[PDB]
Enzyme design. Structure first.
Site, PDB file in Angstrom:
ATOM      1  N   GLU A  87      -0.744   9.636  -6.230  1.00  0.00           N
ATOM      2  CA  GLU A  87       0.456   8.767  -6.196  1.00  0.00           C
ATOM      3  C   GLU A  87       0.907   8.319  -7.576  1.00  0.00           C
ATOM      4  O   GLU A  87       2.082   8.129  -7.794  1.00  0.00           O
ATOM      5  CB  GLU A  87       0.233   7.586  -5.253  1.00  0.00           C
ATOM      6  CG  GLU A  87       0.262   8.068  -3.788  1.00  0.00           C
ATOM      7  CD  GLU A  87      -0.499   7.145  -2.820  1.00  0.00           C
ATOM      8  OE1 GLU A  87      -1.000   6.087  -3.229  1.00  0.00           O
ATOM      9  OE2 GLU A  87      -0.630   7.503  -1.630  1.00  0.00           O
ATOM     10  N   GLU A  92       0.875  -1.155   0.000  1.00  0.00           N
ATOM     11  CA  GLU A  92       0.000   0.000   0.000  1.00  0.00           C
ATOM     12  C   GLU A  92       0.931   1.228   0.000  1.00  0.00           C
ATOM     13  O   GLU A  92       1.675   1.515   0.966  1.00  0.00           O
ATOM     14  CB  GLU A  92      -1.006  -0.049   1.165  1.00  0.00           C
ATOM     15  CG  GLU A  92      -2.094   1.075   0.975  1.00  0.00           C
ATOM     16  CD  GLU A  92      -3.038   0.817  -0.206  1.00  0.00           C
ATOM     17  OE1 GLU A  92      -3.007  -0.272  -0.844  1.00  0.00           O
ATOM     18  OE2 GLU A  92      -3.860   1.711  -0.494  1.00  0.00           O
ATOM     19  N   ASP A 116      -7.258   2.578   2.318  1.00  0.00           N
ATOM     20  CA  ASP A 116      -6.681   1.348   2.904  1.00  0.00           C
ATOM     21  C   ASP A 116      -7.701   0.240   2.891  1.00  0.00           C
ATOM     22  O   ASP A 116      -7.354  -0.920   2.618  1.00  0.00           O
ATOM     23  CB  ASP A 116      -6.269   1.563   4.379  1.00  0.00           C
ATOM     24  CG  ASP A 116      -5.259   2.687   4.542  1.00  0.00           C
ATOM     25  OD1 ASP A 116      -4.479   2.938   3.578  1.00  0.00           O
ATOM     26  OD2 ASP A 116      -5.264   3.327   5.630  1.00  0.00           O
TER      27      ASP A 116
END
Ligand SMILES: Nc1ncnc2c1ncn2[C@@H]1O[C@H](COP(=O)(O)O)[C@@H](O)[C@H]1O
Ligand SMILES: Nc1ncnc2c1ncn2[C@@H]1O[C@H](COP(=O)(O)O)[C@@H](O)[C@H]1O
Ligand code: NA
Ligand code: NA
Lengths: 460, 450
Positions: free
Chosen positions: B290, B260, B433
């Protein structure tokens, strides 16, 4: 152990077992005398050859391509290298020419033969393509992994071949100054000596991997060996005829690394000149961070820097070749990729660059480098290593004339560069003035430094 | 269904997220301890990090006067004690990717959930859900014991502290009345050295293979916690070599590994994390920003900027294929507001149908967490199923077909589904998450069908 072992009497790491992969091939030489050339030329219409020379084939797919490029070479006396991109022509070459000699080539194959010559405890070589003609060129003492009823054995490699396996043969055609031949109604006199090289670059031999029969047993091989020396990634293609790509093979190569590392095997990769910038970058990304030791030459520092984004430095190393810049480029490569130790070999000096926490002293690092250049000097002087006593031949070759100058520039570089995150050791090479052999000496250096590195790690 | 028959190891980052309510009396008693002129002077200096109680008071009073949300790092571990003695916490909850994922999987009651963090003070251990286990070595033998009792007294405490303030509150800085003009939060993140030493510590390290034998998958995160340099001469690279050793130990045991990923500001450190970790694992979960951050340090500056600026699905697909092409792990999952995506290799075993069902499980599970505040038991999943796919589903689908028309799709498998977006979520922390946990769990389940 016999227990006859004497500390005072016995530098070669005899007790080590080493696995090498993946590249081994046949290096064959053909002497082109007058009759050979004329008979080759005579098979073809001279006008058809002349037209093909004008078209200027950049690779060899048919016999005429080879004849046109060779004749062009001979008329100008200019050495050249042209890839063979058609596997079916192996048969043509083999029916058309007699080979003066056939030798083992390829990094894994040449390193395997050297280590068997040194008589270390066990040498096991692996190549996915092992026809009988290749297997027979390995020295006695080289082993190959075999599966005998779901159990892993090592057998003499000369006995382990598969007929039908693709045959990677690189052919060197040697010509001499002064030979004359006729192209139709025109006499040609070769203006100088040289060589025309035809390298095997067809698809079948670019599938570089551990094949599916041996793959499940890599862990069991790992239990047997102290070190693995891997090379041959440069033979990969970016795209394959069945939809596979270089990435597909690199995922399999990372699986192989994991199997050895989990078994506590140290892994050395011998890097090579990689033509294709796209493949070069993939090899650097997929392989180098995940291994322990990496062996490169000077030209390769700049090529790696360049793909990592250090363009200013790559240009500077290329333009000036300063020792200070080679040490800086090695430090950066180690910092970026974060393997364990880098070894760089150049004409006049060898170098190690390690992390500040490497277990070896600078003295041990120097002796490992010394052993590499001394083994190369021996091999260059003798042609082939046949027993451990041959190492002593290398000891008789002095460190080169530039030794003082190399050491002075090294001290200057230390004053100029931030040294704290590293151990750096630079030693002069032992250069043989008139060598009997020069092919593959960088691989010999790398094999010898890595083997002694392993042995020194065992005392920490 | 819920995959149940799976055992997962998660590491390395877990922390406490604690809330303090700054009411008039809390603020005034805090300020009263200090010389108001010295407070004003420190405010003029404007410390960027908290090393001493006055740095914290100075930055806090300055944000209260402006009514301005702010985050300032704590760089002094010794001040944990000062914070804890000075303030009462309204709430303490588990945070950090590996903590949040551990608690999610334990809530789903999968067969086994083992968490590891190298720093486990009693206060942290207690915030894990019943069912989370921790590797414990007794006389050379490994056991998996309830994490809540596996703590070490004296371990560093990574606590992020959120100070909540309300508009209208009044306090005195010396003789000046200050009235807070807007509500907001002043956050003090734990950024001291001891908690940046992210690794498996040497007591458990030798046993990672034996853990590998027990689990089907491992989810790794927390590499964004490393520092470039350490006070004992170590550097990020030292911890990254240890991290690669851990990956090797699980991969040889046939464990699939998901990383992650997270934001790293330092580009040089960001690139080290990408270089050392991502090509070596199987699954990688990222969000839209990201993709751009990774692309940036691979040298795709112009593409990364388009992504940061415009959020167009077409550039996220291209960016995703570039990342998988360059780094060559097995599967990329991308989570964004309106859609989730997988990009794989042409030879991935899963069908596009299974890839889409894995993503649907991820977003559904997040929708449940967003609706309920937590995943309490496997039936909480059903609550997510009643959150419809978002209003932009049609638009996403069109944009997706348009993207494939313009882009070289080679034979990558690319699957894009819309998110189930909850209208009034009780919780918005850990959703990404949670998606990654659910998507990876189901990926492992589907891999068993081939
Ligand atoms: N005549 C020689 N004697 C000893 N070592 C050599 C000799 N020639 C080359 N080497 C070593 O082999 C390395 C690679 O050589 P080359 O294959 O010429 O690039 C050089 O960097 C030297 O370190
Ligand atoms: N209200 C919501 N309901 C369900 N999922 C959400 C909601 N808001 C965000 N998400 C998902 O959670 C992910 C994490 O984003 P963030 O909220 O920025 O940390 C986003 O990419 C969305 O896919
Ligand atoms: Na030899
Ligand atoms: Na060489």
């Amino acid at each position: 152990s016999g227990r006859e072992n004497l500390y005072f009497q016995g530098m070669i790491p005899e007790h080590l077992s080493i696995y090498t992969a993946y590249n081994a091939n046949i290096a064959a030489i053909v002497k082109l005398n007058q009759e050979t050339i004329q008979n080759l030329i005579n098979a073809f219409d001279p006008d058809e050859v002349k037209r093909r020379i004008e078209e200027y084939p950049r690779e060899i797919n048919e016999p005429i391509d080879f004849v046109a490029r060779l004749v062009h070479t001979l008329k100008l006396g200019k050495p050249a290298a042209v890839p063979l991109v058609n596997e079916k022509m192996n048969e043509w070459f083999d029916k058309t020419f007699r080979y003066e000699e056939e030798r083992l080539g390829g990094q894994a194959g040449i390193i395997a033969n050297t280590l068997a010559g040194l008589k270390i405890r066990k040498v096991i070589a692996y190549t996915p393509f092992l026809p009988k003609r290749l297997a027979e060129l390995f020295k006695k003492g080289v082993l190959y992994p075999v599966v005998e009823n779901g159990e892993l054995q090592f057998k003499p490699i000369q006995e382990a071949y598969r007929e039908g396996d693709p045959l990677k043969i690189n052919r060197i055609f040697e010509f001499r100054k002064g030979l004359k031949f006729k192209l139709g109604d025109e006499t040609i006199e070769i203006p100088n000596s040289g060589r025309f090289i035809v390298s095997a670059r067809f698809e079948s031999i670019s599938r570089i991997e551990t094949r599916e029969d041996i793959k499940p047993f890599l862990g069991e091989i790992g239990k047997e060996v102290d070190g693995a020396i891997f090379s041959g990634y440069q033979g990969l293609r970016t795209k394959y005829s069945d939809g596979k790509d270089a990435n597909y093979y690199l995922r399999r190569a990372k699986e192989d690394i994991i199997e050895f590392k989990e078994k506590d095997v140290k892994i050395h990769v011998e890097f090579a000149s990689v033509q294709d910038r796209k493949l070069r970058k993939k090899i650097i990304t997929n392989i180098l961070p995940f291994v322990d030791s990496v062996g490169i030459d000077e030209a390769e520092i700049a090529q790696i820097l360049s793909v990592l984004g250090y363009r200013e430095l790559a240009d500077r190393i290329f333009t000036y070749n300063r020792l200070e810049d080679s040490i800086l480029g090695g430090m950066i490569i180690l910092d970026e990729l974060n393997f364990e130790i880098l070894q760089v070999h150049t004409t006049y000096y060898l170098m190690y660059i390690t992390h500040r926490d490497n277990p070896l002293s600078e003295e041990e690092l120097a002796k490992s480098l010394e052993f590499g250049t001394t083994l190369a000097a021996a091999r260059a002087s003798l042609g082939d290593i046949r027993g451990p006593d041959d190492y002593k031949v290398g000891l008789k070759v002095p460190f080169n004339e530039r030794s003082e100058y190399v050491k002075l520039r090294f001290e200057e570089a230390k004053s100029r560069l931030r040294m704290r995150e590293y151990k750096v050791v630079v030693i002069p090479t032992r250069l043989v003035q008139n060598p009997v052999l020069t092919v593959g000496l960088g691989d010999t250096i790398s094999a010898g430094a890595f083997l002694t590195y392993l042995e020194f790690l065992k005392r920490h």
